[PDB]
Amino acid sequence: ITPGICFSTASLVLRATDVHPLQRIDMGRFDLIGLEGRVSRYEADTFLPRHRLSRRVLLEVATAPDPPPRPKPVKMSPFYLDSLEEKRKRQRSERLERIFQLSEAHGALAPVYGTEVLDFCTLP
Amino acid sequence: FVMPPVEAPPPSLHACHPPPWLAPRQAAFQEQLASELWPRARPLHRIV
Amino acid sequence: LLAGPPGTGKTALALAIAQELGSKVPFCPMVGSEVYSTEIKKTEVLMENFRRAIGLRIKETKEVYEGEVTELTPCETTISHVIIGLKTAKGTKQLKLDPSIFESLQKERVEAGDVIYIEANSGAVKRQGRCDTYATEFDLEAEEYVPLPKGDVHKKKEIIQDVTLHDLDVANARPQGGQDILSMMGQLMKPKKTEITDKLRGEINKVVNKYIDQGIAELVPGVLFVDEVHMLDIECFTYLHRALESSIAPI
Amino acid sequence: TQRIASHSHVKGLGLDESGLAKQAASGLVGQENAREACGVIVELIKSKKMAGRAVLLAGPPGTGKTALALAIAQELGSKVPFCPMVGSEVYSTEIKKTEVLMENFRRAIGLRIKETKEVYEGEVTELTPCETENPMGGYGKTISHVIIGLKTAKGTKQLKLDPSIFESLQKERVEAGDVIYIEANSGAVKRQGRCDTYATEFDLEAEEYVPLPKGDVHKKKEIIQDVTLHDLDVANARPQGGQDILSMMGQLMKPKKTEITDKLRGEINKVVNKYIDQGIAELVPGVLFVDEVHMLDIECFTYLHRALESSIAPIVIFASNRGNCVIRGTEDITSPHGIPLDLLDRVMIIRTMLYTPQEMKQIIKIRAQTEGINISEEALNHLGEIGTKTTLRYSVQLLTPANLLAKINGKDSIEKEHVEEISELFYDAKSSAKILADQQDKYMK
Amino acid sequence: GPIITYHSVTVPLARCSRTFITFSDDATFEEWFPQGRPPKVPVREVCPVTHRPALYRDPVTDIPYATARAFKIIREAYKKYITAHG
Amino acid sequence: ETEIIEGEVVEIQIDRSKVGKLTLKTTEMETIYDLGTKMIESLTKDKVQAGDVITIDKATGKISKLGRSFTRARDYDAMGSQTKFVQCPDGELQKRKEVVHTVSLHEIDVINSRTQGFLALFSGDT
Amino acid sequence: VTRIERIGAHSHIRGLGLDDALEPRQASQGMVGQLAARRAAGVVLEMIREGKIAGRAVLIAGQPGTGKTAIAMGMAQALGPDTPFTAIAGSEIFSLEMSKTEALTQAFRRSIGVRIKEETEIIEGEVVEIQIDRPATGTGSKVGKLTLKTTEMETIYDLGTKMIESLTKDKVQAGDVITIDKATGKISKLGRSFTRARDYDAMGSQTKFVQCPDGELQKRKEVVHTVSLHEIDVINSRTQGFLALFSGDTGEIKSEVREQINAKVAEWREEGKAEIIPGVLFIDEVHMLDIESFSFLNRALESDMAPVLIMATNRGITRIRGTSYQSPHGIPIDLLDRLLIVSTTPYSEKDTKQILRIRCEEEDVEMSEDAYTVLTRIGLETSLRYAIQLITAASLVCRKRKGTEVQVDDIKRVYSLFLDESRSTQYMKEYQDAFLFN
Amino acid sequence: VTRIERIGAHSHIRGLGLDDALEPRQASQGMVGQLAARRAAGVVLEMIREGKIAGRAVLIAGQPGTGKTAIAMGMAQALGPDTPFTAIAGSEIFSLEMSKTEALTQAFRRSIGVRIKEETEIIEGEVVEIQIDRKVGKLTLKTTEMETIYDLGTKMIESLTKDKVQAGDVITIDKATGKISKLGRSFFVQCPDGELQKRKEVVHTVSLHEIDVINSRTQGFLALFSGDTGEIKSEVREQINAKVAEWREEGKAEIIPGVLFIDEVHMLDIESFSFLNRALESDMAPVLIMATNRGITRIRGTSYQSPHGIPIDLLDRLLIVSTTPYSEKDTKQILRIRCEEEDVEMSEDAYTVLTRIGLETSLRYAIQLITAASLVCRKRKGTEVQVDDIKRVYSLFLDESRSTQYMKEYQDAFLFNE
Ligand SMILES: Nc1ncnc2c1ncn2[C@@H]1O[C@H](COP(=O)(O)OP(=O)(O)O)[C@@H](O)[C@H]1O
Ligand SMILES: Nc1ncnc2c1ncn2[C@@H]1O[C@H](COP(=O)(O)OP(=O)(O)O)[C@@H](O)[C@H]1O
Ligand SMILES: Nc1ncnc2c1ncn2[C@@H]1O[C@H](COP(=O)(O)OP(=O)(O)O)[C@@H](O)[C@H]1O
Ligand SMILES: Nc1ncnc2c1ncn2[C@@H]1O[C@H](COP(=O)(O)OP(=O)(O)O)[C@@H](O)[C@H]1O
Ligand SMILES: [Mg+2]
Ligand SMILES: [Mg+2]
């Protein structure tokens, strides 16, 4: 029994391939092989084209009050600041825009094959 | 009956200031792989 | 074809062409003897270089939340959301996170006092050490202490990055991640170049065209320079006959 | 099956009951001597008492060698294995040539297994132990049987089983109203879900609720399964279904043909012999057809000597249209059929001759009938004249373009003008070669 | 202790093999052999609105239904009941 | 052609991983389902929760998540790489799915060659 | 019913047919003629049986159809299943998975068997009564008792937990004749002494019974384990070697593993643990080996673990593969010096007739004397194998016409239907342009 | 005691033996004669150390046994261990693991080093007491001058538990990583003297190939020891080159161009030469030095004849250094140097006889005969090698010429004569 080999290298070498997120684009918009076994032809072709969110619906839901509580089953301004509120509503608008853009980006791609095709073509 | 003449652990990579995320990721990967695969390797115990 | 006696400046002329084009145009230099790979067929090497020469420019704004973690509280109804508190030199921000990010936070072992960043678009979490204000909490810990981030918690940057079609091909040649046993055992497998199918090439072309129509991508056809082309054999030349006639090939 | 291939008209050898070959029968025309020899070979295959015998079909190209082999296969039937193979297939990037040849040899030797599978189906209606009035040991209760009531569509039967089945029943979590099946040969209970009559429209289970079994409670049938020695060899070399780390590795790794050892093949042979002796299985030795044998190299031929000398080998049919050609893998060694004289000494040579114009016309008419094409007598004569020059394949290949041209022209039969136009549109090998020779400077290489 | 005794004997018919299972206590015997009665067939519920066979079950009203119009009618009736009874 | 159930998840109650109830809704419908052991296991494996928009295959029971409904409380500042917000499906909870696609024989061969052979349809390591 | 092994080329050869003095009989055990070659083969067989000299090489050389492979098969059948006999072709050593030297090494080491002989205590008896008591709930110690019976004994055994588990796994009942190995605890069922109770259902058709064993219960039996050197190398090379025993895929075995195995086997032989059973490797058509393989053979025959090597070749002065050098038999002279050459003479008329008679006896074919004369004339004119094939062809033709004895007409008919090399070459010369290349 | 590095063929070469003006000395640093070749090698060494010109290629050409490899070894010795010097043979680029172009690319990138300096805190001392309770813990360490108690964190507690540390062990800890290595026990290594916690400057020179292999895949550093690199993608190599350029611009790292030596380069084929033609034109290319003794010879893989077996297009990019045959004086001086290296004492008559033998047959034959004569002298209980011992080993061991003559005498007994 021998001790292992301790290979020492510069700490900078281990970060050679690392790229900061602000310096690289999102490669998940071209991820086709990752969609296999998870996304179906139904989702890409019938559901998402019909039930995609719109900016109008997103804004309406965000601005509307909370929904009423679900019924139980039955067996049958001195300290107000204008600038702070303007900043907060601008942040809310940015958040809603980001939500919309990310939801559009994450369901833009259609599978090459889809779950249904693979299941049909997969013999026991 | 054949035994290797020498037995060593795998070579280890050492840096003074490594990325603090590499080691936990490698540890989690090894732990999950061991927890998933060691029960399946029990039949080869006598051979090992 | 640049034909002439040795020392007459063919390589210099190609490099002058590259300088005239600029660093924005993909110039792929290859030697004719580089097609004799031991992992893929020669035509696969030629097609990989062809796709390398074609470039795609993508304009995107990236959002990253970076700072020291002051609070990490999952909110139970399962977990509806995660409330996190990030601190920087320019203030403190409270963020609501999608519950799927909680698994990533738990994997990275993120606790209060750790300096992390979160990608807004992907939810990726990287714990980049402990804050140096806590360097004196113990006299001897095996920790890497990192300065507190300087800018705002929410950082926005609009970037333009050039990628080649080969990058998208190799990104879609093998799966990434995956918590299944087969995926984990595949991570240990030696990375070998593979003969990427024409179906995948066509699908990637369709994706590129879709994003070009959307207006987030621009195509830079680029140039592939083959030096010492006489080192190619008859099969390579015959395949070049078809490849050059493609409507997708570079110069 | 619905698409018409080149040998779609060959339904067997047109042999009389005495073995003499009829002039035109079963889709075959002419080649009477070759057909008679192939009938003798078919009888040899059916006799099942010879191993490693080789037959070489030798003749000019387009003389019915492949057609004769397929007629042999049709005569044998689907029961007899028939493994077609071209000589180019031995060159593989995964296994050696000898391994490919051995694998095809084992593919040609088939085994037919006959067994009776007896099962008891039903929905469990009653589950009552049969206690004994005298408990063994004095204390507690002892049971001698467990009564299981099984209900099907057209009956209900009770089965007095061994008490030991109580553990299997508990392991399978079998309760009243569940559908189970018991196998006689093993005495084990398997729960194939619950009956659907106890399921409501508000349930969401997928594989839990099953229909009530039809038919009788006691079902027994004879299962005939046809396998080959290569199937068993491959299934044992790279097994699928294990839960150990090796099976997981096999699933993960890319499948690859391996050099199956003589130990595994001997074990498989022993198991097959044991099964035959028990009466379970019957050996069905078939045929390995190696077309374009001349593409094999000298190593393959040398291995073929030992392969044919074996007592387990099938009956091998070769085919070669070569003359005194040079054997591949050798430097300037010429043999009469591209086959070394050592292997030619081990084969029986069947000669296929060229076809007379009348036989060519008959073959054209048969091919037109098979392809659903009506051809006039004058068009048939013109096409036979075209076939006198050029080849027979060219004539049978002008039939469908001419039919398409007639259909476009609005006619239900091929006339002479359509054949003339098709001949003008398409060139044969000889006409193209003449054109190339006349313009050898303008072409490449 | 509480045991289950598995017994195999050789008895004359000239001889045959028999197996017996002995339970030390009646609790174990009841546990392994509950002698459960046959289950009951559920009643095929029917939609009160359209009289078609029921396929759904509104959780708020617990009223099975088989049509979206039936669902709307049931919810309207429930709203009217809430308004009246309060 | 496959029969499916498609709706937004309202409530998941599991009593003690033995038996439970699942409530699904559309814009025009809402119903509750009785779950078995395997259905509960499949729901727990996929981490299905409230507000998720899911489809369930009646024959096989496999669950694929289309998206989640957007509410005022789900205004996340960061979203995961796979989550996306979709509208609650309309129409009827039970639906028939018709899928027509063109594949080649080679693709079916590659699919049935090994356990995850569809990956070779991208890599080419057939 | 037809077994997996059918009538082949050498199915009639049951041995060399020699007497005590290794004097070849004219016709015995299938062998006819080749007296000098059979005597040499018998001497080589005695050398193999003695098993004292390692790495002896013999070359069977002669014209095609002179009985080289027949002599090799006779030697193999005369050796018997106890002594290893690895028969391979020369082409088989060219492999994409391993080197030629590695393939030759594996071929050599498949021809040496290691046999381990040990005595173990064995219990064989008829189960009268088996009782197993287990806790109703939770982990506990199972207690059991087993009764075993022979013709002269009956003992009641107190069972331990692991024996209880083994019996439970084997599902041992009363009347089962079981074998128990005391050391390993392995239990093997070999039959039922009587039927189960008839009142039970879903039991199936009862098979035949087995008589109860006699003698004492706990006997002592000799257990023999035999593996080859190749099997040891494969199972010691890597963890997955036992699967490589069936799938091949051994790659190239490290020389360190083989050296360790050689040392261990020598130690075992000195310590009386194991005996070495050297065998034979038969390489048919050795002329397909290249210069590198022959050079490896040169030094591989110099090991003390090498078996007797028997080669067959029908080549004259021919170019060695991989080189441009002409050598006798296609073999380099350096290897030709390390081997003894056994020549096979051509057969006469009477030897051919006797071979035909033996083949007809093997194939259950009845033939007339005139038919035998005609067939022998054909065999002399064409070849022996052509006549052998015409034997079966004429048998089938005769059976087709509802006959019982093969006549001259059937032989002429099969001569017309099936051609030899000479007539095929003549007919191809007549139509030379029709055939494709040259 | 016998160590791994025994006396080899070039063990006596310690440098080029040049002065400050690159004027060679007659005998210095193990080198004798060949003034022009040594001066050219010194110029090439100055070029390597300057580091300004990239991809310069030099070929050392001359007859067999004329010091080509000796000159290369002297060049390698004159450079320190700091500058990379990758020495391969032409046959080594022919691999089943990677392509020839990949092998030459890795050979090139092994010759360029990246020098990175970083600071680390290292704690070295003797363990006095270790306490862990259910996590919190304390650790007391001492040197010969000071003693201290540390409050341990969770990660360091786990690290100290994983590597069994008990009282009395002398250990060093890397504070940032928990890397604990036990260097003995003391009561065997003396306890450290100075400060317990020391800030050290650690300098690593990492080759571009090493960076590529480490960053090729997860656990990819293992490929630096077991091959298994495959063919690294060109994207990774371009990214590494860009990042190294970024480091050089930001001052985080320094580039140390080195030397790739390909002895017997005539074994390369036309494809390898064509690849080298353009691989030398990169700015990250090292200095390539090649040696070959071939005259006008067929280029491997072709049917063309070239002056060195190297195609003329590559030869146009080379500077050629010609080695001349040695004189009697130079041969005698080399024999003296080799005798001094092997600790062999000879008489002057023995030296004269050996010089005549070396001139008549070959320098390597005489160098080989030195050790045989020493052994023969030791066999007869002698202390100094005489002419009789040299004659004895001349008769015992043949050279190429006499062996060929004797073979021609019995050419029929040998195998495959042409
Ligand atoms: N017209 C030119 N002007 C300046 N330098 C040149 C010119 N042509 C060639 N060179 C230089 O000569 C050297 C050899 O030319 P090169 O590009 O190798 O020609 P080729 O590629 O045809 O062999 C190069 O280093 C290049 O810089
Ligand atoms: N005697 C025949 N009777 C009927 N059809 C034939 C006959 N000979 C050839 N054919 C048909 O003509 C075509 C010629 O091919 P074929 O003669 O089999 O090629 P080869 O001579 O290489 O075996 C085949 O499609 C075959 O079906
Ligand atoms: N002396 C013999 N005795 C019996 N059978 C023989 C004899 N010689 C040849 N045969 C038979 O003739 C057939 C061809 O002989 P074979 O041994 O294959 O020739 P070769 O020596 O060229 O291999 C074989 O089936 C063999 O059984
Ligand atoms: N000028 C020299 N000075 C010192 N030693 C030398 C000199 N030339 C050759 N040698 C020694 O003599 C031997 C000759 O080898 P060398 O001349 O390097 O062969 P090559 O011609 O292949 O380069 C070597 O061991 C070398 O150390
Ligand atoms: Mg033979
Ligand atoms: Mg040298």
What is the residue-wise DSSP string for F13-52? EEE---EEEEEEE-SS-EEEEEE-HHHHHHHHHTT--TTE
Q: What is the DSSP letter of E46?
A: B
Reported as type and span, the H/E element at residue F75 is none
CATH code: domain of residue D19? 3.40.50.300
Which residues are paired to H201 by β-bridges? H119
H392 vs H399: CA distance, rounded Å: 14
Angle between helices H363-379 and H348-360 in degrees, nearest 10: 140
Whether residue C182 and residue F123 make contact (CB cut-off 8 A), yes or no, is no
Q: Please say whether the beta carbons of H335 and H355 come within 8 A.
A: yes
Residue from H40, G380, A21, G387 nearest C117 by CA = A21
Is residue H140 included in any domain, yes or no?
A: no
Neighbours of B21 (CB within 10 A): 19
Tokens matching residue D407: 């259909």
In chain D, the residue whose alpha carbon lies closest to the alpha carbon of B41 is D245
Nearest ligand, CA H314: 1
Whether residue C182 and residue F116 make contact (CB cut-off 8 A), yes or no, is yes
| Type of residue numbered E53 | P
Neighbours of G334 (CB within 10 A): 14
Q: Annotated binding site for ATP: which residue ranges of H?
A: 62-69
Q: Annotated binding site for ATP: which residue ranges of C?
A: 4-11
Cβ(C10) to ligand 1 under 6 A?
yes
CATH code: domain of residue D400? 1.10.8.60
Residue from D199, D178, D125, D151 nearest E43 by CA = D199
Do H322 and H213 share a structural domain?
yes
Strand pairing class (H112-133; H254-257): antiparallel
Give the number of domains in chain G: 2
Burial of D14 (0-12, 13-18, 19+ CB in 10 A): buried
Q: Please say whether the beta carbons of D287 and D317 come within 8 A.
A: yes
Give the number of domains in chain D: 3
Distances (CA, A) of E79 to A7, D353, E83, H327: 75, 94, 6, 119
D96 vs G94: CA distance, rounded Å: 7
**Given the CA of residue G34, which atom of ligand 3 is nearest to it?**
1
| Ion ligand 5: protein residues whose beta carbon lies under 5 Å | G 69
Is residue G353 included in any domain, yes or no?
A: yes
CB contacts of C62 in chain A (<8 Å) are 21-22, 24-26
Burial of C78 (0-12, 13-18, 19+ CB in 10 A): exposed
Tokens matching residue G347: 């057969």
The stretches of D355-428 forming alpha helices (DSSP H) are 357-370, 377-388, 392-397, 399-409, 416-425
H64 vs E38: CA distance, rounded Å: 101
Protein residues whose CB sits closer than 6 Å to any atom of ligand 4: H 9-10, 13, 30-34, 64-70, 334, 363-364, 367
Do D112 and D141 share a structural domain?
yes
| Ion ligand 6: protein residues whose beta carbon lies under 5 Å | H 69
Q: Does F60 touch chain C if contact means CB atoms closer than 8 Å?
A: no
Task: Identify the domain boundary among D213, D235, D257.
Answer: D235
Range of the domain at H320: 8-112+207-326
- Helix then strand then coil, in percent of chain A rounded to 5, is 50, 5, 45
Which residues, at least 6 apart from G428, have a Cβ–Cβ distance to it below 8 Å?
D58, D323, D324, D336, D337, G435
Do G357 and G333 share a structural domain?
no
Do D267 and D243 share a structural domain?
yes
Task: Please tell me the total number of residues recorded for chain F in this structure.
Answer: 126
Is residue D445 included in any domain, yes or no?
A: no
Experiment used for this model: cryo-EM
Task: Identify the domain boundary among D354, D370, D401.
Answer: D354
Is residue H194 included in any domain, yes or no?
A: no
Tokens matching residue D234: 């491959």
Is residue G329 included in any domain, yes or no?
A: yes
C-alpha neighbours within 13 Å on the C-beta side of residue G284? 25
Burial of D211 (0-12, 13-18, 19+ CB in 10 A): exposed
φ and ψ at residue D216, rounded to 5 degrees:
-85, 160
Our CA-based measurement puts residue H276 at a distance from the nearest CA of chain A, in whole angstroms, of: 27
| Type of residue numbered D337 | H
Burial of H379 (0-12, 13-18, 19+ CB in 10 A): exposed
Is residue H127 included in any domain, yes or no?
A: no
Cβ(C9) to ligand 1 under 6 A?
yes
Whether residue B32 and residue C184 make contact (CB cut-off 8 A), yes or no, is yes
| Residue found under tokens 């995850």 | F116
Q: Does H415 touch chain G if contact means CB atoms closer than 8 Å?
A: yes
Q: Annotated binding site: which residue ranges of G?
A: 62-69
Do D263 and D325 share a structural domain?
yes
Is D314 annotated as ligand-binding?
no
DSSP calls for G219-253: EEEEEEEEEEHHHHHHHHH-TTHHHHHHH------
Burial of G51 (0-12, 13-18, 19+ CB in 10 A): middle
Neighbours of A60 (CB within 10 A): 10
Task: Identify the domain boundary among G309, G325, G347.
Answer: G347
Q: Does E55 touch chain D if contact means CB atoms closer than 8 Å?
A: yes
Do G39 and G20 share a structural domain?
yes
Residue from D326, C109, D432, F102 nearest A114 by CA = F102
Q: Please say whether the beta carbons of E57 and E64 come within 8 A.
A: yes
Do H393 and H338 share a structural domain?
yes
CA of C11 to the centre of ligand 1 (A): 7
Do H370 and H297 share a structural domain?
no
Q: What is the DSSP letter of A45?
A: I
Do H294 and H230 share a structural domain?
yes
Do D116 and D69 share a structural domain?
no
Distances (CA, A) of H287 to C34, D36, G393, H258, H331: 22, 78, 78, 6, 31
| Type of residue numbered A59 | L
C-alpha neighbours within 13 Å on the C-beta side of residue D378? 7
The sign one gets for the Cα dihedral H114, H120, H126, H128 is negative
Q: C-alpha angle with apex H77: H4 to H200, nearest 5 degrees?
A: 80
Chain breaks in chain G (C to N over 2.5 A) after: none
Radius of gyration, CA atoms only, chain C: 25
**Given the CA of residue C5, which atom of ligand 1 is nearest to it?**
22
Do H396 and H273 share a structural domain?
no
Which residues, at least 6 apart from G206, have a Cβ–Cβ distance to it below 8 Å?
G192, G195, G196
**Given the CA of residue G72, which atom of ligand 3 is nearest to it?**
17
A110 vs C207: CA distance, rounded Å: 9
| Residue found under tokens 């359509």 | D418
Residue from D437, D368, D352 nearest D403 by CA = D368
Cβ(C6) to ligand 1 under 6 A?
yes
Task: Identify the domain boundary among H301, H326, H351.
Answer: H326
Is residue G155 included in any domain, yes or no?
A: no
Distances (CA, A) of D415 to D367, D376, D418, E16, G291: 17, 6, 6, 86, 66
Tokens matching residue D291: 């077309």
Nearest ligand, CA G284: 5
Strand pairing class (D347-351; D334-335): unpaired
CATH code: domain of residue D214? 2.40.50.360
Is residue D70 included in any domain, yes or no?
A: yes
Tokens matching residue H368: 């080989």
Cβ(C8) to ligand 1 under 6 A?
yes
Range of the domain at C153: 53-171
Reported as type and span, the H/E element at residue G408 is helix G408-417
Is residue H14 included in any domain, yes or no?
A: yes
Do H82 and H92 share a structural domain?
yes
Q: C-alpha angle with apex H15: H9 to H17, nearest 5 degrees?
A: 120
Which residues, at least 6 apart from H377, have a Cβ–Cβ distance to it below 8 Å?
H383, H384, H385, H386, H389
CATH code: domain of residue H30? 3.40.50.300
D359 vs D382: CA distance, rounded Å: 15
Is residue H357 included in any domain, yes or no?
A: yes
Task: Identify the domain boundary among D183, D211, D235.
Answer: D235
| Residue found under tokens 């290349």 | G437
Do D260 and D150 share a structural domain?
no
Task: Identify the domain boundary among H297, H326, H355.
Answer: H326
